[PDB]
Amino acid sequence: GPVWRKHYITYRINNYTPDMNREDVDYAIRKAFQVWSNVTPLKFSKINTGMADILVVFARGAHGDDHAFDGKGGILAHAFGPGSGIGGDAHFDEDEFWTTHSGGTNLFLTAVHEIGHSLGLGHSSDPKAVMFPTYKYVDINTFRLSADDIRGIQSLYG
């Protein structure tokens, strides 16, 4: 499927969950992009205005895309593969409780997965992969991509 055909990729945070400190949302998203730039030639920059490649959105229920959210639990987030318009965009269910830690749903870990999709990755069948489509908290301070994630992303870039 689709990949970004350029190395400089922009993102923008459309709005902020009230669940977290603003600075902690910025840092979680930044760190999640870094996971992928670590293993590809991509460079990611946060822009404050105008059209970004990847728009990061918090929203609940129906939110304008035909992929309605389902309240607390279940679907936590979804994202669109590379492309124009909404392509690349990553949406996070405001009905979850987003955190920097093991409580609620960890924003950083979820965003690593969502950004994987924004870059063109699909789901992995390997429970060890961040792209495995089941949320399970792991210690974020020492998080690492699985072999499967790295082979997946390096099949698309670099």
Question: CB under 5 to 8 A by kind: which of Zn ion, Ca ion, ligand HS1, none does 65 bind?
Answer: Zn ion
> Using alpha carbons only, what angle is made at residue 98 by residues 90 and 65, rounded to the nearest 5 degrees?
30
Question: CB under 5 to 8 A by kind: which of Zn ion, Ca ion, ligand HS1, none does 70 bind?
Answer: Ca ion
23 is in an annotated binding site: no
Q: Is residue 114 among the annotated active site residues?
A: yes
Residue 20, phi then psi, degrees to nearest 5: -130, 160
Q: Does 74 bind Ca ion (CB under 5 A)?
A: yes
CA distance 20 to 100: 8
The span of 22-30, 45-53, 54-62, 129-137 binding ligand HS1 (CB under 6 A) equals: 129-137
The residue with its CB nearest to Zn ion is 91
- Of 33, 90, 94, 153, the one binding Ca ion (CB under 5 A) is 94
96 is in an annotated binding site: yes
- Of 64, 103, 133, 158, the one binding ligand HS1 (CB under 6 A) is 133
67 is in an annotated binding site: no
- Whether the CB-CB separation of 40 and 75 falls below 8 Å is answered with no
Residue 20 vs residues 58, 70, 93, 131: alpha-carbon distances, Å = 12, 21, 14, 24
> Using alpha carbons only, what angle is made at residue 67 by residues 65 and 73, rounded to the nearest 5 degrees?
135
Which residue carries 């990847």 as its tokens? 54
CA distance 21 to 130: 25
Point out which residues bind ligand HS1 (CB under 6 A).
74-79, 109-110, 113-114, 117, 130, 133-135
Residues annotated within a binding site for Zn(2+): 63, 65, 78, 91, 113, 117, 123
Point out which residues bind Ca ion (CB under 5 A).
19, 70, 74-75, 88-89, 93-94
